[PDB]
């Protein structure tokens, strides 16, 4: 409930300060003026056009990685219970893992962008 | 003996990065199964009341269940307030 | 009927379902599905689940940020469309909300039942548990089991993730 | 399928203990160590019972035993005793660690003026064993009869008679 | 693909397969089946060729649309009864839902149009295990959960499954698509005896399986995808010609052929549980796959098609690579019929 | 429906229980063993049309090892079968047993006193 | 101590139900008053809906959200 | 189909997880605990067929539990009586139900 | 079932139904493919929490994460069939025929 608060406050903070921006000074809009900016000369072709990613394994890569987060996030309290030689074993064999995945997509040239 | 020293001083030079990184990992691997506290660590996990010691029904032979906390039978943590 | 906070949630959930379904540009689809992540936190927060819920809301923005990467790359069409911009991209939008809103009063003020039971309303907070007890989160304990009952559960993870980097660097190789 | 058995108003009637959480951990300790028996008897029917209806008598001895203690804590010094849980319902998280000169003074009075010893790291969470007049209770799930299970499998082993059977096969 | 990557993703696909044959709880079967999907995919381009690219990503829509659909029904079915054991679906809708993605998963009919088209999108070694490995998982799912089947969707399935197979395969040049139609009619037939007789199912994949492993080997050891360049075949190799037309024809279920024991054994079956028309119907349909099968032994093996001169110079080579169990496999899909009674032994 | 998968005192993966052994072993000149050793004869002839090679002589070790493992794999496969089949006449006669109501002893009529219609045929 | 107070204060609430259920539904045509819904005599935890169900929405939402929303 | 390998190796990978009433940690019990308890003891060892019909009162004891259909009944066929008999008004709810209580501990 | 319950549910057959009624872009259905497993983590948690089941608690992490590899896997597709075609658009999948 205080969270609610504080969010609608901030929110409600940044569309006041928007508005007058938007409604405190004098607009003088005109086509030339709100024309795209390319450094003086008018774009050869749109910004809509695709635009390639060189990265794009190590994109496809990171949502594996960040799901592990996921799973070792909890490790904290799982550091609590009895069984601390099981837990110890899954915690490093994840982090294991972890590495061995990194291994093979370096050594496979994964991690090289794309020319 | 002479091929794993040329390596290891090659890998140094050029990538000490990793080989710091194996160094940690391999010491996180191995260190805990050598380690006479890991035991204690369990111990103190052991110790923790998280939740409330039901009593038990004195059916009249249970010498080792103490009558009261501060009789001597049961379980003692004498071990842990002198580490 | 209490604040009717939990409703006003899932209503705002099934709204941003409502906005990627429709299937306008994906970076308009991305933006709703971004929505409904952190209203569907929301939702969990008010039910004891924080972790899950914060969880869930990191793990799909993270997604989210990788669509948006691959939308500027391969899904790009030049006059991209937001809901207004095309009649059936609008038309799915509004049955959406359309069908949204008549399920809902027929399950508010009556009793219907649709397709396995029914529902009278009374606010999602008439099932809670009374419990009274506790120095941690239950929630918190039985995520952290995972590496002490569910030794099983974590194998196969770690294999199934190790696989998907082998499998994905297999895929896009080409050739 | 019937109607819930209820205690009237008046059988929920008892003297409460209306002091406050901080009052009530600062003397947690030495409470525990001296009213334990009437505890530990409310617990055992608590979990043997599984109903709070057949330890309402139980529960009222806890109040009645809680309200001696705190008798004897105000009769013999109720100064050191409020100076200690002032202190420590100060605290957000009422610590013990905070107020270790208070706890101090507390504890020395009541070791000269009560013979109380305070218990030590470890005790009062041990699973200790209850002497109890309240027989043990036969069916506290209120189980129906569990249905007979199919018979069983008896006798030898005989090749089956004229084979398989199937169809023209001999055997 | 390098042969260890390759190694490692099939023991993963057979790993998925197993887990979902061990498992007790409902969420490891779905993992069960999220691991061998995740392995499946890469196998099915294993030669890129973009046809195989189509393939995967047609067979990657339906199979995860298919494991959202069971998870769905296994999330109902714990909502209605806290419980995660496979057993018989406490709830309807659950089981309606969780039939719809076995029967998406396995294609049967409606859910019948991406066989067809993954299989003539991928070589002949994945169509072999496509169609012969990953029936095992959802059969097995079924045959578990089959007291809570409903019969009505489950025999309407079935018989649109025998149907659609049958039409299917008589439009078909290509001997992948005849496959694959040949695979729809024979899902048919092992569902729609599954509410009755599980023993008779896995009877059924069991025979199925040795077939389709012969004719997909036979189809391997010369290497031919078309009709026409089957019918090459009698002026290179007869013998593998007429162990082919004699594998068809039991795969057409003629009698005394390996082929006819299921059929026999599943209008039996359902004769003891008062089900005349269905079996009738189902045994009427089936000599359209008859027909689509001695169309082909015409082409390749009844009658010698005209050659081309370069295949003289093929005279002079011999198959290098040999599989060791063709002959097994063979001999298992026809001979077989007299020992029927070892069915026993499946229960 | 899976009529024995759940028998109680059932071993998961056993394919051969001790009480099976209480029956007598199918006797190795067995007509189904003899089968099973022609369905590798044949296996082995069909192994040397494939390969390009004398059907009848090419290679007799290998033809050796297909009838022998085919008669040893089915020596096993009939013994469970025939264990299979005695389990479900023992279950069957035990129910019938102790289910008497379920199937009453009829005393039969003579065909002296059956009353049959005759239907000409003419 | 404390569960001795909380089952004394839960068993109450019921009471004081019962005692205006008795009232309320006085002339339903075949309502028994106090009657369970499961086949089985055992005690049974109530629900909160059995708790507030007859209360304000202040002490409502303090019971279902109270610890949730205290920051 | 299934091959139950856990049973013939007492190697226990998933059964742990089946039920709510197979050893929590920190011995937090689910919300039904005993009514769970009750319906798997009552239908153990007789078979799905038999269980289905003979331990019926107790599966159905444990879904009210589980959904508590009957009891959110019972409370609005409650409420909607009160709110008759007040809109007329003759009910005139307690003291006690209006948030002028005396609590106790 | 109270309304979030079925609100939820509403959530999953509109994200199954974005999937089945394919517009143009593959992306579009990778994002409804998304939806379904948002939907299915929520559902389940809910039902979870509610009934207190504790070791339950890890199945909607393990949920999660075989939604990447799912996620992970749709894109590399993706990237494949636009390397073909320039365009990710459905209808450029035609070349089986059933
Ligand atoms: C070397 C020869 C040798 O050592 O043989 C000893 C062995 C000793 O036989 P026996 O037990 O003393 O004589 C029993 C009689 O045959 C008396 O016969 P039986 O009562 O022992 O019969 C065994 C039974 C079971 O036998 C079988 O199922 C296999 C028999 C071969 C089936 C026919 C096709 C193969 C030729 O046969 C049948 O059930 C009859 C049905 C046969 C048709 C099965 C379905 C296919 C029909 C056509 C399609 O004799 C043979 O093996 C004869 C050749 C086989
Ligand atoms: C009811 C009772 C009856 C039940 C019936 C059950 C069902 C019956 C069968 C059902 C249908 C089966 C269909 C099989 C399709 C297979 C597809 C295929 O392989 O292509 C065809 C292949 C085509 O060959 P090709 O195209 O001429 O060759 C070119 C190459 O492909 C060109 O490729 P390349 O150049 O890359 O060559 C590489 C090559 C050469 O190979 C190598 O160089 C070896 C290299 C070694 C690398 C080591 C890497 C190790 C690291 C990876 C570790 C992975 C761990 C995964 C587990 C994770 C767990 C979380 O490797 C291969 O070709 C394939 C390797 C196969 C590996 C098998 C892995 C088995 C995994 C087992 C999973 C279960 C484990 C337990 C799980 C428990 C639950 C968790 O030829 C055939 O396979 C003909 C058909 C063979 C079927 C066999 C007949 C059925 C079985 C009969 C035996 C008895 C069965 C019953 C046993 C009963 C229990 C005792
Ligand atoms: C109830 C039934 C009871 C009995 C069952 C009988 C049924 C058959 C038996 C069971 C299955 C047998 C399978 C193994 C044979 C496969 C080998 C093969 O292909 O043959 C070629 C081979 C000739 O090769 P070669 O002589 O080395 O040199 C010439 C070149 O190879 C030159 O060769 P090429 O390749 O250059 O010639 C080209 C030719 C090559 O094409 C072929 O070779 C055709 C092979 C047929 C494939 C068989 C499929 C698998 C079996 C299924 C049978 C279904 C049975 C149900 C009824 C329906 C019948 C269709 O292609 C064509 O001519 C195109 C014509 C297309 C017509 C389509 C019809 C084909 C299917 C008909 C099968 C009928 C049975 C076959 C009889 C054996 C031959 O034939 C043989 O020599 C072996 C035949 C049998 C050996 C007998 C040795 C035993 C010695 C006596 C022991 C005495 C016992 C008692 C002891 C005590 C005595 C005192
Ligand atoms: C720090 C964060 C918190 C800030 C706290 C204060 C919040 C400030 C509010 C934010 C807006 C700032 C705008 C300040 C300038 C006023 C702009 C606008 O509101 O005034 C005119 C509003 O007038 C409109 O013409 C409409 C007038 C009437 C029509 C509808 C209004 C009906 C209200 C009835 C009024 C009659 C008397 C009411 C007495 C109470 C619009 O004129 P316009 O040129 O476009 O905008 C450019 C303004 N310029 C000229 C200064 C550059
Ligand atoms: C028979 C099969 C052998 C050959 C085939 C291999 C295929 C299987 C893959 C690996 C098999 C391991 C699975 C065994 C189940 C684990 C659970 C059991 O063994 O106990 C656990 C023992 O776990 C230990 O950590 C040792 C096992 C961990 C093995 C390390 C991982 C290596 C797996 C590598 C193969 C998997 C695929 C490839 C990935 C690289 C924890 O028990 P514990 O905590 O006492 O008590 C739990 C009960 N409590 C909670 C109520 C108290
Ligand atoms: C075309 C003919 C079919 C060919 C089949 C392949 C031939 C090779 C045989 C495969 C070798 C493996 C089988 C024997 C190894 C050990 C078996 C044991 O471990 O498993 C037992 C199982 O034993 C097997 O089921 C028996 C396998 C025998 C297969 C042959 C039957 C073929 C049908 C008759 C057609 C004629 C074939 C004659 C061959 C020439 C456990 O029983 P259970 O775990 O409780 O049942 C699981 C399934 N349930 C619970 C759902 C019922
Ligand atoms: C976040 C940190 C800062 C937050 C912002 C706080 C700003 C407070 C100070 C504002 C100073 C006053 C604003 C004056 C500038 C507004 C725009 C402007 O100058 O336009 C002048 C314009 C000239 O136009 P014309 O003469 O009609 O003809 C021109 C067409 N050819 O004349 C005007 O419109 C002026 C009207 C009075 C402006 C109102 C000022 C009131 C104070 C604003 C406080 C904002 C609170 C919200
Ligand atoms: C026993 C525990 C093991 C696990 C614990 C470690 C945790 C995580 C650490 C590893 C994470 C993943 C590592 C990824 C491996 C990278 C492989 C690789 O690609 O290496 C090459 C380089 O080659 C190497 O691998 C570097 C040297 C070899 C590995 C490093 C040393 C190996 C172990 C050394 C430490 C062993 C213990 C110390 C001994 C102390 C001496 C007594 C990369 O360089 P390039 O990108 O090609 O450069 C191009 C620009 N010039």
Known sequence: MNIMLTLLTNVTLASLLVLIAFWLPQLNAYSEKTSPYECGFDPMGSARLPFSMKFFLVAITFLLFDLEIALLLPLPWASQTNNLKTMLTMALFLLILLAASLAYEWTQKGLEWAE | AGRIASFLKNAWAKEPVLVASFAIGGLAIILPSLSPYTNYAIRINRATPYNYPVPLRDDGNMPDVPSHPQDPQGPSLEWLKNL | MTMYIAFILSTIFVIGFVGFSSKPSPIYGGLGLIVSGGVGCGIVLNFGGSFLGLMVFLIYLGGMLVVFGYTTAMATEMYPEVWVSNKTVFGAFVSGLMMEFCMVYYALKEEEVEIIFKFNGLGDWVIYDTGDSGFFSEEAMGIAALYSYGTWLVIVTGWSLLIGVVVIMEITRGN | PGIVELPTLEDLKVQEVKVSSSVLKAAAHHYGAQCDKPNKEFMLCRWEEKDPRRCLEEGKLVNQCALDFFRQIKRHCAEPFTEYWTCIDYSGLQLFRHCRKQQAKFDECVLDKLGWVRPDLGELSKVTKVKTDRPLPENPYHSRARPEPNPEAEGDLKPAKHGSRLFFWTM | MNPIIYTTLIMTVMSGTMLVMISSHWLLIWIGFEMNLLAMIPVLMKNFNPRATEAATKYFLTQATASMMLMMAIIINLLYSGQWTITKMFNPVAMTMMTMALAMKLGLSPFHFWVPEVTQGISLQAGLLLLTWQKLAPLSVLCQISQSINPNLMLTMAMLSILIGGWGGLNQTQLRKIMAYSSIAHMGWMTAVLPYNTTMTILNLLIYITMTLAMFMLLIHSSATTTLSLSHTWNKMPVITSLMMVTLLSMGGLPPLSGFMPKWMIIQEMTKNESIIMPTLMAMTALLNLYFYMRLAYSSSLTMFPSTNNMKMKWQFEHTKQMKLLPTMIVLSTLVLPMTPALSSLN | ?122 | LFQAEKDRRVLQMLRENLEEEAIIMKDVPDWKVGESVFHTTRWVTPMMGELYGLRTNEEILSATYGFIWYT | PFFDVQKRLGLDLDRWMTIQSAEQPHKIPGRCHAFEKEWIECAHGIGGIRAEKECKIEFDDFVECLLRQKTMKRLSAIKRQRDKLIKEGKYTPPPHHLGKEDPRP | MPLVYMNIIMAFAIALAGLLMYRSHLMSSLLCLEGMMLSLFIMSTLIILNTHFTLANMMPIILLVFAACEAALGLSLLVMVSNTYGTDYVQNLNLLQC
């Open chain 6, 1 to 122: 429906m899976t009529m024995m998968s759940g028998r109680p005192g059932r071993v998961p993966l056993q394919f051969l229980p001790n009480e099976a052994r209480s029956l007598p072993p199918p006797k190795l000149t067995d007509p189904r063993l003899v089968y099973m050793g022609f369905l590798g004869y044949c296996s082995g002839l069909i192994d040397n049309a494939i390969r390009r090679r004398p059907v009848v002589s090419a290679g007799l070790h290998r033809q050796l090892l297909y009838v022998t493992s085919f008669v040893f794999f089915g020596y096993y496969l009939l013994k469970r079968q025939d264990y299979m089949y005695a389990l479900r006449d023992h279950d069957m006669f035990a129910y019938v047993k102790s289910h008497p109501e379920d199937f009453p002893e009829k005393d039969k009529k003579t065909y002296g006193e059956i009353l049959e219609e005759f239907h000409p045929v003419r």
